[PDB]
């Protein structure tokens, strides 16, 4: 019974670990996108200025 609950609890660990890994992969994907977007938001803010400068010029 404990083993059956263990198997299910372990299954939950696996399902939850599955989700954990999936979220981790999504976390990293999103975080990697965050980072590319941090780079883009800054490059874009810089472009906001390069373009603003092209307008000023």
């Amino acid at each position: 019974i404990i083993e059956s609950d263990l198997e299910r609890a372990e299954e939950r660990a696996e399902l939850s670990e599955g989700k954990c890994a999936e979220l981790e992969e999504e976390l990293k994907t999103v975080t990697n996108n965050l980072k590319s977007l941090e780079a883009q938001a800054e490059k874009y803010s810089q472009k906001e200025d390069r373009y603003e400068e092209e307008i000023k010029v």
Partner: protein, 375 residues
């Protein structure tokens, strides 16, 4: 059984079959496109045992079954096996008999006639469906993705479609049927894992490698620097647990497999790969179309779930693409399930209620009717 005589929707690929009813936001169930058969002689008696197993039965009992796929790179060649998969789908998981509901099936238009003709015939003659509609995968993907314009990259198990659509119109001269798919990526991985000391040559082994690929592989936006390190260090290897408790670790091979999509020569294919094929589909469209397709590359189907794939594709296209212009990829979570989701959407549109073949028109005309009524 439902609160409306809603169409049933089944997206039957060379990999897996996704099914549910029109109007939902997900298939109710997913089955492998597999019919399994025992390769052993029975010894005990009164053991039950089927002549063949389908879908998830085929996979659960696979220890002694040979597993066959009725669909060959998008074409059903074995329709007796698809009828059994469908009966299971409709009656055991969806719990709805098609006799009371229209059914929507999907294919690439590039498919050489037999698939849409037999899909239409099976549902009208073995299931007695009151109506049928064979849909375009690019259409379904764009509805699911929130687009009317763009290129559908559906790089799934069978064939890559890469069809461009503008304002809801096909641009068919630019569609490039590509013999590079998720099934080939699996075969490549079986061979390179053999080199590492873990041979994979049987059905059970093929299913294991597909599972390894789906859980461990990625493509990488920069495969060259990734392999320079992954091929040099165990710190980039990921462990996978084999069904019998043994462990296989995979290093540069993890991405080497997905890389085939950009390096098709890995499987002996004479191709530029998916990024250049997508680029050429954009290029082949008129000059006032090209810009809208560059800005709207849309991921669908399978393999589009690999880490680094949206970035790998956008960067490769950007490299091939002209300057000034912004090249962009749309990669919705409705990935791999997007054709099914599109089926739900399309089946339910008021502007699509005249597109259905009734089970009258079908019998007066025969299965060749699919060429006049669907597309």
């Amino acid at each position: 059984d439902e609160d409306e005589t809603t169409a049933l929707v089944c997206d039957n690929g060379s990999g897996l079959v996704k099914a549910g009813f029109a109007g939902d936001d997900a298939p109710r169930a997913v089955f492998p496109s597999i019919v399994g058969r025992p390769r052993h002689q029975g010894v005990m008696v009164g053991m039950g045992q089927k002549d063949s197993y389908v879908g998830d039965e085929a996979q659960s009992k696979r220890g002694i079954l040979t597993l066959k796929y009725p669909i060959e790179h998008g074409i059903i060649t074995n329709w007796d096996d698809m009828e059994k998969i469908w009966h299971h789908t409709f009656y055991n998981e969806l719990r709805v008999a098609p006799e009371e509901h229209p059914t929507l099936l999907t294919e690439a238009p590039l498919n050489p006639k037999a698939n849409r003709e037999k899909m239409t015939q099976i549902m009208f003659e073995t299931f007695n469906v009151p109506a049928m509609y064979v849909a375009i995968q690019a259409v379904l993907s764009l509805y699911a993705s929130g687009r009317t314009t763009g290129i559908v990259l559906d790089s799934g198990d069978g064939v890559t479609h890469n069809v461009p659509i503008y304002e809801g119109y096909a641009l068919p001269h630019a569609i490039m049927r590509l013999d590079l798919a998720g099934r080939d990526l699996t075969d490549y991985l079986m061979k390179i894992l053999t080199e590492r000391g873990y041979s994979f040559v049987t059905t059970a082994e093929r299913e294991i490698v597909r599972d390894i690929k789906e859980k461990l592989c990625y493509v990488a936006l920069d495969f060259e620097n990734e392999m320079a390190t992954a091929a040099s260090s165990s710190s980039l290897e990921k462990s996978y647990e084999l069904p019998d408790g043994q462990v296989i670790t995979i290093g540069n091979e993890r991405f080497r497999c997905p890389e085939t999509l950009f390096q098709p020569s890995f499987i002996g294919m004479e191709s530029a790969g998916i990024h250049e094929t997508t680029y050429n589909s954009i290029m082949k469209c008129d000059i006032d179309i090209r810009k809208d397709l560059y800005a709207n590359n849309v991921m669908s189907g399978g393999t589009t779930m690999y880490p680094g794939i949206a970035d790998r594709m956008q960067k490769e296209i950007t490299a091939l693409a002209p300057s000034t212009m912004k090249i962009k990829i749309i990669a919705p979570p409705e990935r791999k399930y997007s054709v099914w989701i599109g089926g739900s959407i399309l089946a339910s549109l008021s502007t699509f209620q005249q597109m259905w073949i009734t089970k009258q028109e079908y019998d007066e005309a025969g299965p060749s009717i699919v060429h006049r009524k669907c597309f």
